[PDB]
C-alpha cells in the first residue's frame, strides 16, 4: 500500500527475535546504547557546515550527500571482533529499503563517493564518534533514527526517540546533488535569503514589493513536509526535485488539490485577506497548517512568494521572475486569437504583468543542455494533465522553441513570446503584432534590491531573425528537405568545423534562412554560456546535397571551458518557399589531449628527483613551436622546454631535475601550447 506521508510512522520492534528462541537467553552479552548525540546545536559543526544553522528548529537538519558527525555511547566499549551494529533512518509507515525509505547505514572503514555509510573517527571510553555520509540522491524529509545491534537471536534496536529525528534537505553545495549550484553568492540569494523583492507595475513605471519568505521561521519546514503529505506524494520520489517542484506548483494553489491559496481577482475578497495585504509567506503557510484548509486570498505574486518559500525551505534554489505583458493562451495554439473587437468570441487575454518561479536543477529526463533554471508556476491558469499546475519547463528549451520537452513548455512560451493574431470571422487574418507579448522579464538582483533584466534567457531579441525561427519551431512542436549537422573531429585547444548538411530530394530550388547557437554545458547537463551565434542564408538547388561548414575557433570557446564540459549546438532552418522548419539539437564531448607526468627517483624534500612530462601529438597535423611548461610550487621553480616541431601522432618526452624544498602533499602541473593546439594540461599529485 502507498507510503505517501512523512507524518505517519511504523513501530520498529526493540527486540526483534527470530525463530523459536529458547527461554533464558542472556542478551547481556551484546552492546546496548546508553545515549546518542547528534551535536545538533545551531552553533555547532553540523548545522554550520550544512548551512542549516538558521532554521528555528531544535532537531538536527542536514543536507544530503555531505557527511555529519554523531556519537553513540554503549554499555561497554565497542569491539569489532564480537560486535556488529548499524544505524537506520526510516520514513513513513511502510518503509522499504528498495524504495529508499528504510536506509540501513553500515559501519565502514572508509566512506565511499555517494553511498550511505558511517565511519568511526574517534573512540574514547565506551563511546564511538561517527562521520555519517548520506546518498546525494536521498529522499528529502524528516527521518526517524535507530541504532540496531545484531545478535545471533535477532536485532536489538533503540526505541523511538523524537529527540534524534533528523531532517535531510536538498544540498546546493554538493556537486553530486541534482540541485548543485557552483556559485556561493548565488547560493546565498537563492537558498539562504529569506527576504526578497517582487517587481510589478508597468514596463516604464516599475514598482517594487518586498516579501518575507521566512523559510527558516518556526513551523515552516514542517509545513512544507505537510504540503507534500497533503498531495499524497509518494515518499520515494521526494528526492527528485522535478517531482517536488511539479507537486509544489499544484499544491500551492487551492484548485483541484485542496492546496494552500485561493486565488481571487474580484475586487471584493469576501471573508478573507485581500491579496494586496499580505507582506510575506509565513502567516499564509502557518494558517494552512493549523486550519488544514485553503487560505483566502492570493493573486500571481502571492502564489509565487509562497512557492518561493516552499522551494528554498527544502533546499531547491529558487527565484521569482516578472513578465510584463504576459499572454494567457486559452486554446493551446501558442498565439493570441483576437477576433474583430468581439469580446464574446475572443477568449485569450494579456496581463499587465505576471509572476512565477524558477527552480534550479539538472534535467536528467531531458537531453543534455536543458538543466539549470526551470520555470514553475503555481498561479492557476490552465490545466496540465487534469490539474492546475505548471512546469518544470526548461527556460533553455523555451528560448530555442524546443517546447516538446516536458513540462508545460508550450504554455510558458506562449506567455513570453506569442504573436497577436487579429482575425475576422464571417459567413480572415487582418493584423499580426510580434512584439507586444513579454516586453521585459526581470528578477531580483544578487546582493541588492534592483532589477536584473533576464529577458534574453527566455527569448531572442525582437526583430532578430533568431526570434522568428525559434517561434516557428515552437509552433511546430505544438517539403522533402533533410537537414543534419555533425561536428568534424573536435579537439580541445584547436579550432573545428561544424558541418551542417541539407539534402534536397525534390525537383525544386529552395532558399533557406537559418541560425545556429553553440553552447558550453556542464557534464550534468546544466547550460553555462552561448559562445557563438550565427544566422545565415543558403540556396538549395534541386536533387543535391549541400554542406555549409561553420568554423568554430578555439578563442570562441576556450575562454569559457570547465572540467568535463560538453558542447551543445542548436540549428534551426526555414525553407522559405514552404515555411517548413527543420530543427535539431545535439551535444558533443570535446576530445581532450593528454599530458602524462611521472616522477623517477625518490621524492624526499632534500634531494633531487626527475619529472618526466610526456605529450603525444593528438592531431593529424604538424605542431610547431610547442612550448611545454612545468609548475609545482613546492617541487620546482617554474620551467619551460620548447620543441620546434612534433610530427603527426608523434610523442615527446621532457625530463626535469627538481630539488623539492617543502614536505607534504604538493602538486605538479604541466601545460602545452603550439601555433595551433594550445592550452592543454596535465597534473600529478606528489607526496614529499
Amino acid at each position: 500500500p502507498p507510503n505517501n506521508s512523512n507524518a505517519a510512522e511504523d513501530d520498529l520492534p526493540t527486540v526483534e527475535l527470530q525463530g523459536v528462541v529458547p527461554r533464558g537467553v542472556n542478551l547481556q552479552e551484546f552492546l546496548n546504547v546508553t545515549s546518542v548525540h547528534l551535536f545538533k546545536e545551531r552553533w555547532d559543526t553540523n548545522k554550520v557546515d550544512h548551512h542549516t544553522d538558521k532554521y528555528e528548529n531544535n532537531k538536527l537538519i542536514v543536507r544530503r550527500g555531505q557527511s555529519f558527525y554523531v556519537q553513540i555511547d554503549f554499555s561497554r566499549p565497542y569491539d569489532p571482533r564480537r560486535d556488529l551494529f548499524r544505524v537506520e533512518y526510516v520514513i513513513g509507515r511502510y518503509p522499504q529499503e528498495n524504495k529508499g525509505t528504510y536506509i540501513p547505514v553500515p559501519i565502514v572503514s572508509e566512506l565511499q563517493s555517494g553511498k550511505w555509510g558511517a565511519k568511526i573517527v574517534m573512540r574514547e571510553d565506551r563511546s564511538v564518534r561517527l562521520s555519517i555520509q548520506s546518498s546525494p540522491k536521498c529522499i528529502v524529509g524528516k527521518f526517524r533514527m535507530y541504532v540496531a545491534v545484531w545478535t545471533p537471536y535477532g536485532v536489538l534496536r533503540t526505541s523511538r526517540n523524537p529527540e534524534t529525528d533528523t531532517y535531510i534537505l536538498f544540498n546546493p553545495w554538493c556537486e553530486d546533488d541534482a540541485v548543485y549550484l557552483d556559485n556561493e553568492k548565488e547560493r546565498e540569494e537563492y537558498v539562504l535569503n529569506d527576504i526578497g523583492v517582487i517587481f510589478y507595475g508597468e514596463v516604464n513605471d516599475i514598482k517594487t514589493r518586498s516579501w518575507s519568505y521566512g523559510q527558516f521561521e518556526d513551523g515552516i519546514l514542517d509545513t512544507c513536509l505537510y504540503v507534500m503529505d497533503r498531495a499524497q506524494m509518494d515518499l520515494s520520489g521526494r528526492g527528485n526535485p522535478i517531482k517536488v517542484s511539479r507537486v509544489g506548483s499544484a499544491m500551492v494553489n487551492a484548485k483541484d488539490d485542496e492546496g494552500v491559496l485561493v486565488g481571487s481577482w474580484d475586487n471584493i475578497y469576501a471573508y478573507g485577506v485581500p491579496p494586496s495585504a499580505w507582506t510575506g509567506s509565513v502567516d499564509i503557510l502557518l494558517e494552512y497548517r493549523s486550519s488544514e484548509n485553503p487560505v483566502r486570498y492570493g493573486q500571481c505574486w502571492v502564489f509565487a512568494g509562497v512557492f518561493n518559500t516552499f522551494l528554498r525551505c527544502l533546499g531547491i534554489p529558487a527565484r521569482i521572475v516578472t513578465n510584463y505583458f504576459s499572454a494567457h493562451d486559452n486554446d493551446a495554439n501558442l498565439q493570441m486569437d483576437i477576433f474583430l473587437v468581439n469580446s464574446k468570441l475572443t477568449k485569450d487575454s494579456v496581463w499587465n504583468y505576471h509572476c512565477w518561479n524558477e527552480a534550479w536543477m539538472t534535467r536528467p529526463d531531458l537531453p543534455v543542455g536543458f538543466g539549470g533554471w526551470q520555470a514553475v508556476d503555481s498561479t492557476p491558469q490552465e490545466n496540465s494533465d487534469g490539474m492546475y499546475r505548471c512546469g518544470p519547463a526548461s527556460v533553455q528549451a523555451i528560448k530555442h522553441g524546443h517546447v516538446c520537452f516536458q513540462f508545460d513548455a508550450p504554455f510558458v512560451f506562449a506567455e513570453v513570446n506569442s504573436d497577436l493574431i487579429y482575425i475576422t470571422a464571417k459567413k480572415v487574418v487582418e493584423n499580426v503584432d510580434a512584439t507586444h507579448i513579454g516586453k521585459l522579464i526581470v528578477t531580483k538582483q544578487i546582493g541588492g534590491d534592483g532589477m536584473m533584466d533576464i529577458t534574453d534567457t527566455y527569448k531572442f531579441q525582437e526583430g532578430q531573425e533568431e526570434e522568428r525561427l525559434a517561434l516557428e519551431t515552437a509552433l511546430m512542436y505544438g517539403s522533402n528537405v533533410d537537414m543534419d549537422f555533425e561536428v568534424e573531429n573536435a579537439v580541445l585547444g584547436k579550432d573545428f568545423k561544424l558541418s551542417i548538411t541539407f539534402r534536397n530530394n525534390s525537383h525544386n530550388r529552395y532558399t533557406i534562412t537559418a541560425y545556429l547557437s553553440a553552447n558550453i554545458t556542464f557534464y550534468t547537463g546544466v547550460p553555462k554560456a552561448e559562445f557563438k551565434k550565427e544566422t545565415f542564408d543558403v540556396t538549395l538547388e534541386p536533387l543535391s546535397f549541400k554542406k555549409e561548414a561553420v568554423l568554430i575557433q578555439a578563442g570562441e570557446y576556450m575562454g569559457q571551458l570547465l572540467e568535463q564540459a560538453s558542447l551543445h549546438f542548436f540549428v534551426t532552418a526555414r525553407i522559405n518557399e514552404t515555411r517548413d522548419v527543420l530543427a535539431k539539437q545535439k551535444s558533443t564531448v570535446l576530445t581532450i589531449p593528454e599530458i602524462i607526468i611521472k616522477v623517477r627517483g625518490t621524492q624526499v624534500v632534500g634531494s633531487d628527483m626527475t619529472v618526466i612530462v610526456e605529450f603525444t601529438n593528438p592531431l593529424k597535423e604538424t605542431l610547431r613551436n610547442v612550448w611545454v611548461h612545468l609548475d609545482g610550487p613546492g617541487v620546482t621553480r617554474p620551467m619551460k622546454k620548447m620543441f620546434r616541431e612534433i610530427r603527426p601522432n608523434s610523442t615527446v618526452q621532457w625530463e626535469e631535475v627538481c630539488r623539492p624544498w617543502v614536505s607534504g602533499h604538493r602538486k605538479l602541473i604541466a601545460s602545452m601550447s603550439s601555433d595551433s593546439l594550445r592550452h592543454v594540461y596535465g597534473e600529478l599529485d606528489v607526496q614529499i
Partner: peptide, 7 residues
C-alpha cells in the same frame, strides 16, 4: 495584476 485590453 490586471487584464489589459487588446490594442
Amino acid at each position: 495584476x490586471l487584464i489589459l485590453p487588446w490594442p
